[PDB]
C-alpha cells in the first residue's frame, strides 16, 4: 500500500443533525476505547469587557456537580468507570470531552449532556473557584511564553474582542456573579452552536441515538436579538514591550495578520512555516538542521528556542514566530528570522518547498494519532469548516503547493506588511519598530 | 464509517534471537522502533553515564552515513529519529510516511549497528550532556525519582538515566564502542513496526540485522538495599517518595501491586477534580487543607518499587506523608471494600487500553513485551489477568509494603520532612 | 626512475634540513585547519615541536646536522586520512546545497 | 469594485524594488524635461524682452 | 518532524491544589532525545 | 495579573481609515503604503535631478 492508498482507506466522518440544530459527528474505528465530547462556538471573542473571563469561570464549575449529580457525584461516576473528563477554552472555542471504554459510550454521552445542561453553579462553589482562578492568574504570570502570547493578542487586536485574554482581567474574576455566568451560558450554550463529536469503537447510529435521547432538550432557538454573531476584528501593526531586566531570558513574539480558518492559503503558509521550523537547545541536529534559522541559531548559540506559528481565527489570525534568547541575542535572532521570511517571499526553492510539504504531511497524519486527537479534529473542523476535511483532500491541497505558490503566498502576507510585536524580559536590545518594519522588505 | 483489517500483529523470531513484530494498520505513516536491553542498569561504576551520551549520539557519523547526511536525509522526507531510555531498555524510533521507510530504516540501521564514535565528534558532544541534564532536572520529580532508585538499590537499577557531573567530558569513544558491542546484540533486540508490512520488515531484519552477540553482557541482578537520600534546596514545596521492594514485572504479584496502585490513587481522572475515589488523596485531604499525593509503581525485570509520592508545602510534609502512610496501613489491616477494588480494576483496565491507543504507546507496549517476555500477551488476556487479582492479593501487597524495608527520597526545604525511622 | 628525481627533489626542497615532514609545510586553508584540529594529541604536539624547532633554526639561518634531517624514505603523511575526510564531508555539504 | 489611486501605484510600481527603481528612473527623465522647460518658461516670462534670446532677432544668421 | 514538543526547553509555578494535581510521580521515568523534537522526561 | 494589561486607546492618532475596530484594515493597507512609496519615489527623483 502506497501513502496514496492509505489516505483513501480512512473511514469517512459521518455527520447528522438533530431538530434543535445540534450536529453529531463521528469516525468509527475498532478501538476498544473512545473519546466523545462537545465542542462549542463560545470563547472570549464572544465576551465583552464586563464579562470577559466568564467562559473560563464556567470551565471551572462544569465538573463541580449538576442538578442530577450534586457535588463530587459526577466525579465519582467518571472515576469509577475509569474514564477521564477534561476541558479547554480558547478565544473562539470551548470543549468538554471524555475518554472512556467504548462499551461505556452511553454513560459518557449522558454525563456530557448532564454537564452541558444541568451544571449546578452553587454560590459557594463559585466563591471557591474565584480564589482558584486568582491563583492561576498568578501562576500564569510566571509563564513568560503565555504572557508574551497574551501580549501579542492584546496589541495585534487592540480595541477588539480578540485582544482579550481567555481568563479575563483579575477585577472581572473578583466581580463575576452567578447572574453573569448563567447569562453567558444561556446566550452561547445553544444547540446550533454545539457539535457532539466522537471517535473510536462506536457506531454513528448509536451516537446519534444517544444524542437524540440526551440533547433534544437543548435550546435551538434563542431568538433574533440574542444570537451572538462575530464582527471582524481589526488588526494593528504595533508593538508592546514589557521591559523586565530581572528576568533571565527575553521572550519575543512577532506576527503579521493571517487569513483566517477558512482560507486555502493556510496550506501554503503551513508549508512555509515548516521550512523555517522550530528549534530548542535539546535538538540533536544542531549545525546540520535544514532550516537556515535553526542551524544558524544552533551554531552561533543565538537562542534557547524558537517556533513559527499560524494561529487562526474566523476571519483573521496571527502568522509569525516566537523565540526565547539571551539579552544580547535578540537583534541577531530578529535579523535572521526576518531574512528567512524575505528569502521565502523572493527565492523559495523547489527542494526546500518539497521538504516543507513532506514535513506538513507527516505532521498532519502523526497528529491524528489516537481517539482524542481525532475527536478534537472532528469537533473543531465542524465548527470552523462546517465539515471534516479528509486526508485525501489535505494531500491534494499540499500537492498543489510549489516554490511559485510559496513565494506568492508568503509575499502576500509577509512582504512589506506591518507586524505586531510583543516583548517581555531583558529586552533593551529588541529592535525599534521602524527597524523591524524595514526588515519586512 | 466501517474501519479497514483490523489485521493481527505478526511475529517472527530469527535464529540469532532477534524478534520482529509488525502490525499493518494501513495508515499513511509508519513507525518503526528498535528496542534494546541497554538501559542505564547495564552501566557499572567505571562507565556511568555512557548510556546517556549514547542516547544523545544518534546523529553522529556512522560507517554508511555522515552526521550531516543523517540530519538532512531524515529532514528531507519530514521524518523523525528519537532515542528513548528507561533503566532497562533503549528504544530507537523512526517515523515517516509509509513510502519512505526504506530511507529511515537505513539510517536506523547505521545508527545502531555501525556508529563510528569519532574522537572529535564525541568530544564536541559532551557539553550536550550538561544541557540535557539541566533541562530534565528542572523537574523536581526527576531529582526525586533518580535519588529514590539510588537509595533503594546497591547497583544496576540504582544507576541514573543521566550522566553524573564528574563524568561529563570524560565519556570516551572506547566506552561507547564497548557499550554498543556488549549490549546491542541480536538476543537483546526487537524490531517493532506499525504501518508497514511484515514481509518488508522481515526482509530488512534478515538482511541487515543478521548480527550476532547472542544474549550479550547481561548485568548483575539488582540488589534491593533500602535507604534514604535527602536533598535540601529550600523550595517552598517538598517532593518526597517512600517505597519498598514490590515485585518483578511479569509476575502475578506485580498485578496485585498495579491494582493496589489504583485503589490508592494513580493520577487524576477529572480536570481540577477532587479525586473522590482516590484513597490516598482523600485520606490526606481529611488531615490537610495545598498538596498532591499519588501511589507510585515501578516494575522491572528482576525487581520493583512500590509506594507513594507526595508534594506539599514544606511545613506540612510530615503531616501529608504520615497521613498517606497511615492510609496504606489500614489497607494492610484488611480495611478494603470490594467496590473499591472493582473501581481500581476499571481504572487499570481502561488505563491500559488507553495507553496503547496511539502508535507511540502501542510500539512501547509491544517492544517492551518482546524484550521482557519474548512473547506477546494481547489486551484480552491482560484484562483477564487484571480481573483475576483477588482482594486478598491487594491486601497482601499492602502488607508487603508496610513491613518491607523502605527507601525514601525527598527534595525541598526539609525542616519538617521525616526520616524513614520516624514513620 | 621518477623515484630518483623524487628523492633528489625532496632534498633540494630542503624542509628536511630543518627537521620538518612534508605535511608540516602544507599551506593551511580551512580544510587543513579542521584536519589539524582533529589530530590526536601526540601527533598534534609532535607537529607543534617540529614547526617550532624549524622556525628557530630559520631565525638563526641554521640547519640541523645531516644525521637529523628527515629522510625521504621515512616521511609519511600523518595528515592525509584526516584531511581526506574533511574534504569529503565538505563536498557532501556542497552537493546538498546544490539540490 | 476596485482599489484607489495610491493603492494602484503601490501594487503596480512600488511593491517591487526593481520596478520602484525603474519608476524613479524614467520618472527622473520626464521630471527633468518638464521641470527645466517650465522653470525656464517662468524665468523668461518674468524677464520678457530683457534677455538676449528676446532681442537677438534685431541683430542676427 | 515538524511537530514541536508540547513544551520547549530553555536553560540559563504552582500556587493551588488544582495546578498541583497530577504532578506527583506515579511510574518509573523515561528519558527521550530527538533529532527534530525537544527532549522529554516522563514521570 | 498580566491580563490586566490593556493597550491604551490610540484613536487620536490613527488614520481615519483604521478607526473602525470592527473592520479589517487590509482594504486600506495598499493605499496607505502606496502613498508613502510615492513620497519616497518623488523625493528620490528630486534628489537625482
Ligand atoms: C564550511 C563550514 C560548515 C560547517 C562544517 C561542519 O561539517 C560537519 O562536521 C561534522 C563533525 O563535527 C561531521 O560529522 C559532518 O559530516 C560535517 O558535514
Ligand atoms: C632545477 C634543475 C633540475 C635539474 C635536474 C637535477 O637532477 C639531479 O642532479 C643531481 C646533481 O648532479 C644528481 O646527483 C641527481 O641524481 C639528479 O637526479
Q: Could you tell me the three cell numbers for F44?
A: 528620490
DSSP SS3 for B298: strand
Q: What is the CATH number of domain C1-99?
A: 1.10.1090.10
Measured from the Cβ of residue A325, the count of other Cβ atoms closer than 10 Å reads 25
DSSP state of A164: S
Q: Searching chain A, which residue's CA lies closest to the CA of residue B96?
A: A362
Q: Contacts of residue D13 in chain F, CB cutoff 8 Å?
A: 41
Contact check, Cβ <8 Å, E25/B79: no
Measured from the Cβ of residue B343, the count of other Cβ atoms closer than 10 Å reads 19
Bridge partners, residue B240, by sequence: B310, B410
Distance of CA B55 to the CA centre of its chain: 14
Q: What is the CATH number of domain B2-212?
A: 3.30.830.10
Q: What is the CATH number of domain B224-423?
A: 3.30.830.10
Strand B291-299, strand B304-313: pairing:
antiparallel
Bridge partners, residue A278, by sequence: A307
Q: Measured over all CA atoms, what is the biggest interatomic distance in chain B, rounded to whole angstroms?
A: 63
Strand B237-245, strand B304-313: pairing:
antiparallel
User: Whose CA is closest to A351, among B69, B170, B75?
Assistant: B75
Q: Which atom of ligand 1 is nearest to the CA of C92?
A: 18
Query: Do residues B412 and B311 lie in contact, with contact meaning Cβ atoms separated by under 8 Å?
Result: no
| Euclidean distance between CA atoms A53 and A44, whole angstroms | 7
Q: Which atom of ligand 1 is nearest to the CA of B66?
A: 16
Burial of A63 (0-12, 13-18, 19+ CB in 10 A): buried
Q: Searching chain A, which residue's CA lies closest to the CA of residue F4?
A: A169
Going by C-beta distance under 8 Å and a sequence separation of 6 or more, which residues neighbour residue B322?
B418, B423
Going by C-beta distance under 8 Å and a sequence separation of 6 or more, which residues neighbour residue D22?
D13
- With residues binned 3-state (H G I as helix, E B as strand, rest as coil), the percentages for chain B, rounded to 5, are 45, 20, 35
| Euclidean distance between CA atoms F21 and C51, whole angstroms | 74
| Euclidean distance between CA atoms A291 and A334, whole angstroms | 15
**Exposed e or buried b for every residue in C2-27, given b needs 16+ CB within 10 A?**
eeeeeeeebeeeebbbbbbbbbbeee
**Degrees to nearest 5, angle at CA B354 with A62 and E21:** 45
Query: How many angstroms separate the CA of residue E25 from the nearest CA in chain B?
Result: 6
Measured from the Cβ of residue B196, the count of other Cβ atoms closer than 10 Å reads 23
Burial of A219 (0-12, 13-18, 19+ CB in 10 A): middle
| Euclidean distance between CA atoms B84 and B74, whole angstroms | 18
* A238 shares contact with chain F (CB less than 8 Å): yes
Query: How many angstroms separate the CA of residue B62 from the nearest CA in chain C?
Result: 13
Contact check, Cβ <8 Å, A361/B97: yes
User: Whose CA is closest to A254, among A420, A143, A394, A120?
Assistant: A420
Q: Out of E3, E18, E34, name the one closest to residue A283 (CB).
A: E34
Give which of A283, A368, A398 to mutate to test E binding, by max E Cβ within 10 Å: A283
* C96 shares contact with chain B (CB less than 8 Å): yes
Q: Could you tell me the three cell numbers for A242?
A: 514589557
Bridge partners, residue B77, by sequence: none
Q: What is the CATH number of domain A238-441?
A: 3.30.830.10
Give the H/E segment covering residue A242: strand A238-243
DSSP state of A12: P
Which candidate in A12, A27, A47, A59 is catalytic? Answer: A59
Contact check, Cβ <8 Å, B132/E39: yes
Query: How many angstroms separate the CA of residue A102 from the nearest CA in chain D?
Result: 55
Strand A33-40, strand A194-200: pairing:
antiparallel
| Euclidean distance between CA atoms B273 and A60, whole angstroms | 10
Is there a shared CATH topology between the B2-212 domain and the B224-423 domain? yes
Looking up cell 553482557, which residue turns up? B217
How many residue pairs bridge chain D and chain F with CB atoms within 8 Å of each other? 53
Residue F25's domain comprises 3-49
| Euclidean distance between CA atoms B402 and B371, whole angstroms | 31
Residue D4's domain comprises 1-61
A49 is catalytic: no
Going by C-beta distance under 8 Å and a sequence separation of 6 or more, which residues neighbour residue B1?
A11, A12, A13, A14, A27, A28, A204
Contact check, Cβ <8 Å, E37/B136: no
Which own/partner contact pairs does C27-36 have at CB distance under 8 Å and 24+ positions apart?
C31/C83, C31/C86, C31/C87, C31/C90, C32/C79, C32/C83, C34/C86, C35/C79, C35/C82, C35/C83, C35/C85, C35/C86, C36/C79, C36/C82
Measured from the Cβ of residue B168, the count of other Cβ atoms closer than 10 Å reads 18
Total residues belonging to chain C:
99
- Nearest alpha carbon, ligand 2 atom 13: C8
Q: How far apart are the first and last CA of chain A?
A: 46
| Euclidean distance between CA atoms B93 and B32, whole angstroms | 6
* A394 shares contact with chain D (CB less than 8 Å): no
| Euclidean distance between CA atoms A342 and A34, whole angstroms | 45
Q: Contacts of residue C37 in chain B, CB cutoff 8 Å?
A: 120
User: Whose CA is closest to A440, among A267, A329, A320?
Assistant: A320
Measured from the Cβ of residue D22, the count of other Cβ atoms closer than 10 Å reads 12
Contact check, Cβ <8 Å, F31/D24: no
Domain residue extents for chain C:
1-99
Query: Do residues A184 and A56 lie in contact, with contact meaning Cβ atoms separated by under 8 Å?
Result: no
| Euclidean distance between CA atoms E36 and A294, whole angstroms | 10
- Nearest alpha carbon, ligand 1 atom 4: A287
Q: What is the DSSP string of B84-140?
A: EE-SS-EEEEEEEEGGGHHHHHHHHHHHHH-B---HHHHHHHTHHHHHHHHHHTTSH
Bridge partners, residue B309, by sequence: B241, B294
Query: Do residues B161 and B85 lie in contact, with contact meaning Cβ atoms separated by under 8 Å?
Result: yes
Q: Over the Cα atoms of chain C, what is R_g? A: 16
| Euclidean distance between CA atoms A243 and A428, whole angstroms | 7
Identify which of C8, C12, C13, C14 to mutate to test ligand 2's pocket (most ligand atoms within 8 A of the CB): C8
CA–centroid distance, residue B60 to ligand 1 (Å) = 11
Q: Over the Cα atoms of chain E, what is R_g? A: 13
Q: Please, where in chain A does CATH 3.30.830.10 lie?
A: 13-226, 238-441
| Euclidean distance between CA atoms A270 and A112, whole angstroms | 34
**Peptide bond preceding B6: is omega within 30 degrees of 0, i.e. cis?**
yes
Domain harbouring F45, CATH code: 1.20.5.270
Burial of B258 (0-12, 13-18, 19+ CB in 10 A): buried
Total residues belonging to chain B:
423
Query: How many angstroms separate the CA of residue D35 from the nearest CA in chain F?
Result: 10
HEC profile of A269-333? HHHHHHHHCEEECCCCCHHHCCCHHHHHHHHCCCCCEEEEEEEECCCCEEEEEEEEECCCCHHHH
Query: Do residues B204 and B181 lie in contact, with contact meaning Cβ atoms separated by under 8 Å?
Result: no
| Euclidean distance between CA atoms A405 and A350, whole angstroms | 10
CA–centroid distance, residue C14 to ligand 2 (Å) = 14
* C33 shares contact with chain B (CB less than 8 Å): no
Query: Do residues B28 and B14 lie in contact, with contact meaning Cβ atoms separated by under 8 Å?
Result: no
Q: Could you tell me the three cell numbers for B135?
A: 533541562
* D7 shares contact with chain F (CB less than 8 Å): yes
DSSP state of B311: E
| Euclidean distance between CA atoms E8 and E36, whole angstroms | 12
- Nearest alpha carbon, ligand 2 atom 9: C8
Bridge partners, residue A98, by sequence: A36, A85
The CA dihedral of A355, A356, A359, A364, to the nearest 10 degrees, is: -140
* C neighbours by CB contacts (3+ pairs under 8 Å): B
Bridge partners, residue B326, by sequence: none
Contact check, Cβ <8 Å, E14/A136: no
| Euclidean distance between CA atoms B399 and B356, whole angstroms | 31
User: Whose CA is closest to B86, among B142, B43, B40?
Assistant: B40
Q: Contacts of residue B69 in chain C, CB cutoff 8 Å?
A: 92
Query: How many angstroms separate the CA of residue D25 from the nearest CA in chain F?
Result: 7
Total residues belonging to chain F:
49
**Degrees to nearest 5, angle at CA B122 with B118 and B125:** 145
Q: Contacts of residue A165 in chain F, CB cutoff 8 Å?
A: 3
- Which is the CATH superfamily of the domain at E1-43? Cytochrome Bc1 Complex; Chain I (2.10.210.10)
Query: Do residues A273 and A308 lie in contact, with contact meaning Cβ atoms separated by under 8 Å?
Result: yes
Domain residue extents for chain B:
2-212, 224-423
Going by C-beta distance under 8 Å and a sequence separation of 6 or more, which residues neighbour residue A326?
A249, A250, A303, A304
CA–centroid distance, residue B68 to ligand 1 (Å) = 7
Contact check, Cβ <8 Å, D27/F45: yes
DSSP state of D11: I
Burial of D43 (0-12, 13-18, 19+ CB in 10 A): exposed
Bridge partners, residue A197, by sequence: A25, A37
| Euclidean distance between CA atoms B150 and B229, whole angstroms | 8
Query: Do residues B235 and B293 lie in contact, with contact meaning Cβ atoms separated by under 8 Å?
Result: no
Cα separation values, D44 from B269, D30, D34, D38, D47, Å: 94, 21, 15, 10, 5
User: Whose CA is closest to B401, among B229, B231, B272, B280?
Assistant: B280
- Nearest alpha carbon, ligand 2 atom 12: C8
| Euclidean distance between CA atoms A295 and A293, whole angstroms | 6
- Nearest alpha carbon, ligand 2 atom 18: C5
Q: What is the DSSP string of A361-428?
A: HHHHHHHS-SHHHHHHHHHHHHHHTSSPPPHHHHHHHHHT--HHHHHHHHHHHTTT---EEEEEES-T
CATH 3.40.50.300 at A13-226, yes or no: no
Q: Could you tell me the three cell numbers for B321?
A: 506523608
Q: Searching chain F, which residue's CA lies closest to the CA of residue A258?
A: F26
Helix axes of C30-37 and C80-98: crossing angle, nearest 10 degrees: 130
| Euclidean distance between CA atoms A237 and A253, whole angstroms | 13
Query: Do residues A388 and A329 lie in contact, with contact meaning Cβ atoms separated by under 8 Å?
Result: no
DSSP SS3 for B295: strand
User: Whose CA is closest to A368, among A5, A4, A11, A2?
Assistant: A11
**Degrees to nearest 5, angle at CA D18 with D13 and D24:** 60
**φ, ψ at C94 (rounded to 5°):** -65, -40
| Euclidean distance between CA atoms A374 and A36, whole angstroms | 10
CA–centroid distance, residue B67 to ligand 1 (Å) = 8
Q: Could you tell me the three cell numbers for A171?
A: 477585577
**Degrees to nearest 5, angle at CA C16 with C10 and C19:** 165
Query: How many angstroms separate the CA of residue A414 from the nearest CA in chain D?
Result: 12
> Of the bound ligands, which one is closest to the alpha carbon of residue C1?
2
CA–centroid distance, residue B348 to ligand 2 (Å) = 91
User: Whose CA is closest to B298, among B338, B251, B245?
Assistant: B245
* A neighbours by CB contacts (3+ pairs under 8 Å): B, D, E, F
CA–centroid distance, residue C12 to ligand 2 (Å) = 9
CA–centroid distance, residue B75 to ligand 1 (Å) = 17
User: Whose CA is closest to F25, among B327, B72, A237, A1?
Assistant: A237
Contact check, Cβ <8 Å, E35/B296: no
* D16 shares contact with chain A (CB less than 8 Å): no
DSSP state of B270: B
User: Do D and B have ≥3 inter-chain CB pairs under 8 A?
Assistant: no
Amino acid at each position: 500500500a502506497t501513502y496514496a492508498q492509505a489516505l483513501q482507506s480512512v473511514p469517512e466522518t459521518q455527520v447528522s443533525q438533530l431538530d434543535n440544530g445540534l450536529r453529531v459527528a463521528s469516525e468509527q474505528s475498532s478501538q476498544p476505547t473512545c473519546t466523545v465530547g462537545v465542542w462549542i462556538d463560545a470563547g472570549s471573542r464572544y465576551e465583552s469587557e464586563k464579562n470577559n473571563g466568564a467562559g473560563y469561570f464556567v470551565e471551572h464549575l462544569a465538573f463541580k456537580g449538576t442538578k442530577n449529580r450534586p457535588g463530587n457525584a459526577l466525579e465519582k461516576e467518571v472515576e469509577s468507570m475509569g474514564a477521564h473528563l477534561n476541558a479547554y477554552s480558547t478565544r473562539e472555542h470551548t470543549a468538554y470531552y471524555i475518554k472512556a471504554l467504548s462499551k461505556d459510550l452511553p454513560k459518557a454521552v449522558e454525563l456530557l449532556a448532564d454537564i452541558v445542561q444541568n451544571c449546578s453553579l452553587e454560590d459557594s462553589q463559585i466563591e471557591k473557584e474565584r480564589d482558584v482562578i486568582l491563583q492561576e492568574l498568578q501562576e500564569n504570570d510566571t509563564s513568560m511564553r503565555d504572557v508574551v502570547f497574551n501580549y501579542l493578542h492584546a496589541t495585534a487586536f487592540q480595541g477588539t474582542p480578540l485582544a482579550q485574554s481567555v481568563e479575563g482581567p483579575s477585577e472581572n474574576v473578583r466581580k463575576l456573579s452567578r447572574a453573569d455566568l448563567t447569562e453567558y451560558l444561556s446566550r452561547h450554550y445553544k444547540a446550533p452552536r454545539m457539535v457532539l463529536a466522537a471517535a473510536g469503537g462506536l457506531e454513528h447510529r448509536q451516537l446519534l441515538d444517544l444524542a437524540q435521547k440526551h440533547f433534544s432538550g437543548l435550546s435551538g432557538t434563542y431568538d433574533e436579538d440574542a444570537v451572538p454573531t462575530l464582527s471582524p476584528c481589526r488588526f494593528t501593526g504595533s508593538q508592546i514591550c514589557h521591559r523586565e531586566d530581572g528576568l533571565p531570558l527575553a521572550h519575543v513574539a512577532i506576527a503579521v495578520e493571517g487569513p483566517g480558518w477558512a482560507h486555502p492559503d493556510n496550506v501554503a503558509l503551513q508549508v512555509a512555516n515548516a521550512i523555517i521550523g522550530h528549534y530548542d537547545c535539546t535538538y540533536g541536529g544542531g549545525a546540520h538542521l535544514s532550516s537556515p534559522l535553526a542551524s544558524i541559531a544552533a551554531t552561533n548559540k543565538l537562542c534557547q528556542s524558537f517556533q513559527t506559528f499560524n494561529i487562526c481565527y474566523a476571519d483573521t489570525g496571527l502568522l509569525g514566530a516566537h523565540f526565547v534568547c539571551d539579552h544580547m541575542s535578540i537583534d541577531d535572532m530578529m535579523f535572521v528570522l526576518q531574512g528567512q521570511w524575505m528569502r521565502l517571499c523572493t527565492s523559495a526553492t523547489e527542494s526546500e518547498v518539497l521538504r516543507g510539504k513532506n514535513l506538513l504531511r507527516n505532521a498532519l497524519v502523526s497528529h491524528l494519532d489516537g481517539t482524542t486527537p481525532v475527536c478534537e479534529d472532528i469537533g473543531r473542523s465542524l465548527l470552523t469548516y462546517g465539515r471534516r476535511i479528509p486526508l485525501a483532500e489535505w494531500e491534494s491541497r499540499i500537492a498543489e503547493v510549489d516554490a511559485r505558490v510559496v513565494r506568492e503566498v508568503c509575499s502576500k502576507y509577509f512582504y512589506d506588511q506591518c507586524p505586531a510585536v510583543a516583548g517581555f524580559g531583558p529586552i533593551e536590545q529588541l529592535p525599534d519598530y521602524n527597524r523591524i518594519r524595514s526588515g519586512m522588505f | 464509517e466501517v474501519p479497514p483489517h483490523p489485521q493481527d500483529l505478526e511475529f517472527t523470531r530469527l535464529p540469532n534471537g532477534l524478534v520482529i513484530a509488525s502490525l499493518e494498520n494501513y495508515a499513511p505513516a509508519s513507525r518503526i522502533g528498535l528496542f534494546i536491553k541497554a538501559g542505564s542498569r547495564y552501566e557499572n561504576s567505571n562507565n556511568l553515564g555512557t548510556s546517556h551520551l549514547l542516547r544523545l549520539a544518534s546523529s553522529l557519523t556512522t560507517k554508511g552515513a555522515s552526521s550531516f547526511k543523517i540530519t538532512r536525509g531524515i529532514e528531507a522526507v519530514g521524518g523523525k529519529l528519537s532515542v528513548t531510555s528507561t533503566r532497562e531498555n533503549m528504544a530507537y524510533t523512526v517515523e515517516c510516511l509509509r513510502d519512505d521507510v526504506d530511507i529511515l530504516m537505513e539510517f536506523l540501521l547505521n545508527v545502531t549497528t555501525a556508529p563510528e564514535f569519532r574522537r572529535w565528534e564525541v568530544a564536541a558532544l559532551q557539553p550536550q550532556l550538561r544541557i540535557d541534564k539541566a533541562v530534565a532536572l528542572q523537574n523536581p520529580q526527576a531529582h526525586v525519582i533518580e535519588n529514590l532508585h539510588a537509595a533503594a538499590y546497591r547497583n544496576a537499577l540504582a544507576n541514573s538515566l543521566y550522566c553524573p557531573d564528574y563524568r561529563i567530558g570524560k565519556v570516551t569513544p572506547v566506552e561507547l564502542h564497548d557499550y554498543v558491542q556488549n549490549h546491542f546484540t541480536s538476543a537483546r533486540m526487537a524490531l517493532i513496526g506499525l504501518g508497514v508490512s511484515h514481509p518488508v520488515l522481515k526482509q530488512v531484519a534478515e538482511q541487515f540485522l543478521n548480527i550476532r552477540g547472542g544474549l550479550g553482557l547481561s548485568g548483575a541482578k539488582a540488589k534491593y538495599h533500602g535507604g534514604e537520600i535527602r536533598e535540601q534546596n529550600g523550595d517552598s514545596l517538598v517532593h518526597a517518595a517512600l517505597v519498598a521492594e514490590s515485585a518483578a514485572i511479569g509476575s502475578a504479584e506485580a498485578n496485585a501491586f498495579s491494582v493496589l496502585q489504583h485503589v490508592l490513587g494513580a493520577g487524576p481522572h477529572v480536570k481540577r477534580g477532587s479525586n473522590a475515589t482516590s484513597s490516598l488523596y482523600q485520606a490526606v485531604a481529611k488531615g490537610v487543607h495545598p498538596f498532591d499525593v499519588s501511589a507510585f509503581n515501578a516494575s522491572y525485570s528482576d525487581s520493583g518499587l512500590f509506594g507513594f509520592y507526595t508534594i506539599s508545602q514544606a511545613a506540612s510534609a510530615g503531616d501529608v506523608i504520615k497521613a498517606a502512610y497511615n492510609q496504606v496501613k489500614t489497607i494492610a489491616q484488611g480495611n478494603l471494600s470490594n467496590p473499591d477494588v472493582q473501581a481500581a480494576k476499571n481504572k487499570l483496565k481502561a488505563g491500559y487500553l488507553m495507553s496503547v491507543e496511539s502508535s507511540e504507546g502501542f510500539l512501547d507496549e509491544v517492544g517492551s513485551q518482546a524484550l521482557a517476555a519474548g512473547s506477546y500477551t494481547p489486551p484480552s488476556t491482560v484484562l483477564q489477568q487484571i480481573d483475576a487479582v483477588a482482594d486478598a492479593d491487594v491486601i497482601n501487597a499492602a502488607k508487603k509494603f508496610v513491613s518491607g524495608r523502605k527507601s525514601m527520597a525527598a527534595s525541598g526545604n526539609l525542616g519538617h520532612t521525616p526520616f524513614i525511622d520516624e514513620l | 626512475w621518477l623515484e630518483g628525481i623524487r628523492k633528489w627533489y625532496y632534498n633540494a626542497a630542503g624542509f628536511n634540513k630543518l627537521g620538518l615532514m612534508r605535511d608540516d609545510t602544507i599551506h593551511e586553508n580551512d580544510d587543513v585547519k579542521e584536519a589539524i584540529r582533529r589530530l590526536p594529541e601526540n601527533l598534534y604536539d609532535d607537529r607543534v615541536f617540529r614547526i617550532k624547532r624549524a622556525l628557530d633554526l630559520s631565525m638563526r639561518q641554521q640547519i640541523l646536522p645531516k644525521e637529523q634531517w628527515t629522510k625521504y624514505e621515512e616521511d609519511k603523511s600523518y595528515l592525509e586520512p584526516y584531511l581526506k575526510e574533511v574534504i569529503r564531508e565538505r563536498k557532501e555539504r556542497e552537493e546538498w546545497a546544490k539540490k | 469594485v476596485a482599489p484607489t489611486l495610491t493603492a494602484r501605484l503601490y501594487s503596480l510600481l512600488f511593491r517591487r524594488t526593481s520596478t520602484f527603481a525603474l519608476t524613479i528612473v524614467v520618472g527622473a527623465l520626464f521630471f527633468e524635461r518638464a521641470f527645466d522647460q517650465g522653470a525656464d518658461a517662468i524665468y523668461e516670462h518674468i524677464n520678457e524682452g530683457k534677455l538676449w534670446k528676446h532681442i537677438k532677432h534685431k541683430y542676427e544668421k | 518532524a515538524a511537530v514541536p514538543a508540547t513544551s520547549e526547553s530553555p536553560v540559563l509555578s504552582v500556587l493551588c491544589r488544582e495546578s498541583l494535581r497530577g504532578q506527583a510521580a506515579g511510574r518509573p521515568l523515561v528519558a527521550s532525545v530527538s533529532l527534530n523534537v525537544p527532549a522529554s522526561v516522563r514521570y | 495579573s498580566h491580563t490586566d494589561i490593556k493597550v491604551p486607546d490610540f484613536s487620536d492618532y490613527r488614520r481615519p481609515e483604521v478607526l473602525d475596530s470592527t473592520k479589517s484594515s487590509k482594504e486600506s493597507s495598499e493605499a496607505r503604503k502606496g502613498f508613502s512609496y510615492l513620497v519616497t519615489a518623488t523625493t528620490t527623483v528630486g534628489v537625482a535631478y
